[PDB]
Every structure is written in C-alpha cells, then in structure tokens.
C-alpha cells in the first residue's frame, strides 16, 4: 500500500478547510454579545447564557471536520 496511503494525507489537509465555519461562525455569534451589552448593559444575565448556547451549536462544524482529519491520520 502506497498510492492509497498518500490519499490519506491529501484528504486530511482538505478536511481542515471545513473548520472555517467555526472560526468565522463563532466570531459573529460572540460579536453580537459585544455589540449588545454595549447598547444595553441592563440585560446581561439573559443574553450571556444564551450566547454560550450558540457556541456549542457553531462548535459542531469545528468538531465534525476536526474528527475527519484524525480518521485519515490516526484512524483510517
């Protein structure tokens, strides 16, 4: 096995591109909390908790595509 092994590294470097959704995604979700409390410091213990909930939702794309790389380097 050599030709099929080489495809394990090529496919692993591409599955990292799918992690952009977590970089820019979580950015926007967290950025909204910053522009929110500023315009209205009154509501904090209400938007902060839900903000974290959005994190785990956007962190999904950063986990699935992350596991795909291990299934091609330390998995297969």
């Amino acid at each position: 096995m050599q030709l099929v092994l080489a495809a394990k590294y090529i496919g692993a470097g591409i599955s990292t591109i799918g992690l952009l959704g977590a970089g820019i995604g979580i950015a926007i979700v967290f950025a909204a909390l910053i522009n929110g409390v500023s315009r209205n410091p009154s509501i904090k213990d209400t938007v902060f908790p839900m903000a974290i909930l959005g994190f785990a939702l956007s962190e999904a794309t950063g986990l699935f595509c992350l596991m795909v790389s291990f299934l091609l380097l330390f998995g297969v």
Binding site: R39, N40, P41, S42
Partner: protein, 56 residues
C-alpha cells in the same frame, strides 16, 4: 405660571442640552442612529418649544 385669575406663581424649568441627553440613565431603551445628530437637533428644538410654552 398662572395658578389662578387672582394669583400668579413664578416658575423655573431647566433646559437639558445635547451633552445631557447622552448621559441620560434611560437612553438605551430607545432605538436611535448616531448618524443624524438626533441629540444635537433635539436641543435646538426643545429650546424653542419650552420657550414658547413659557411665553404663551
């Protein structure tokens, strides 16, 4: 300030300026765009009406 037809009362009322509109504790509750100088144009208008309600 005319309290009655047989009595009057001198009255005083402050006129908050633009700079005092920002530091207003309750301001965030009202949507506003910091593009049309809303606070700036509120002063030049409030000063007119309040004065008109004082003279009239």
């Amino acid at each position: 300030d005319p309290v009655s037809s047989l009595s009057f009362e001198p009255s005083e009322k402050p006129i908050f300026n633009a700079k005092t509109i920002e530091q207003s504790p309750s301001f965030g509750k009202f949507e506003i765009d910091t593009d049309a100088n809303v606070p700036r144009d509120l002063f030049e208008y409030t000063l007119a009406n309040q004065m008109l309600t004082a003279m009239a």
